[PDB]
Amino acid sequence: SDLGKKLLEAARAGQDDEVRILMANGADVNAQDQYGWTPLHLAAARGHLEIVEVLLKTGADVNAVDKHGNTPLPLAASVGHLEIVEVLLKAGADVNAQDQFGRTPLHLAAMWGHLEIVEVLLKHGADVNAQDKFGKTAFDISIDNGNEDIVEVLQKA
Amino acid sequence: TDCSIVSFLARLGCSSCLDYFTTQGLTTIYQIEHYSMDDLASLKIPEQFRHAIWKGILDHRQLHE
């Protein structure tokens, strides 16, 4: 897809008006790059909220997975894009999706020290006892990385 | 064992950083094995991930493969 390649670039570059015009002209909303990223993956990772919104409104797959088991929600949760996390959850993102290392969105919010995202994920049913492939919970990872605000909210949850 | 940047970032919990390597033609750990904190900053890796990625690169150097 040429428009699909254009849409992935526009989503990468954060050009909302360009994404809207490509979607109006029939661009494949679920186009993939070589790593299995969709425009929604790119917008979630690079913090393009209005593009996430437009893509979801034009039929983007909120639970699309790349070639290493990543959905868009854990990418937004990792970087700390709280608004994107909430929009993805409201569109039906799997709150306890696990990547190839068994990390959930809660693991990655705890890893990179995003307190308000951890709190939002808990409200949406994030699993505090979920273990990754190293046997670790979000709580264990929050200790390992010194994210003290998160240690206090996850302690004996 | 997988020497891809995509696997390396997955193991580190930094998959959200992948596209900052891809846009510069970086695909293997051997291409970035000599990168400083400064080189990573120049990729526009969000600051929160730089130390982890750099320690991953260090851990790779420390293997003396």
Numbering used by the authors:
A (entry chain B): 2 to 158
B (entry chain A): 545 to 609
Question: Which lines from the publication concern this structure?
Answer:
Here we describe the characterization of Designed Ankyrin Repeat Proteins (DARPins) that were selected as tight binders against all folded domains of p63. For the initial development of DARPins as tools to study the p53 protein family we have focused on p63. This transcription factor is involved in the proliferation and differentiation of epithelial tissues as well as in genetic quality control in female germ cells.
The third and last folded domain of p63 is the Sterile α-Motif (SAM) domain that is present in p63 and p73 but is missing in p53. The initial screens resulted in the identification of p63 SAM domain-specific DARPin A5 that was subject for further characterization. ITC measurements with the isolated p63 SAM domain showed a KD of 16 nM and the formation of a stable complex was confirmed by a shift in elution volume on size exclusion chromatography. Structure determination of a complex of DARPin A5 with the p63 SAM domain revealed that the DARPin bound to helices 1 and 2 mainly by hydrophobic interactions. Currently, the exact function of the SAM domain is not known, therefore we cannot speculate if the interaction with the DARPin results in an inhibition of the SAM domain’s function. Pulldown assays with in-vitro translated full-length p63 isoforms demonstrated binding to both dimeric (TAp63α, TA*p63α, GTAp63α) and open tetrameric isoforms (ΔNp63α) but showed no binding to TAp63γ, an isoform that lacks the SAM domain. These results were confirmed by fluorescence anisotropy measurements with fluorescently labeled DARPin, showing interaction with the SAM domain both in closed and dimeric (TAp63α) as well as open and tetrameric (ΔNp63α) isoforms. For the TD and the SAM domain, the high selectivity of the p63-only binding DARPins 8F1 and A5 was confirmed. Fluorescence microscopy detected strong DARPin-created signals in cells expressing TAp63α, TA*p63α, GTAp63α, and ΔNp63α but not in TAp63γ and TAp73α expressing cells, demonstrating the high specificity for p63 SAM domain-containing proteins of DARPin A5. Cells expressing TAp73α, which has a SAM domain, do not show staining either demonstrating the specificity of the DARPin A5 for the p63 SAM domain.
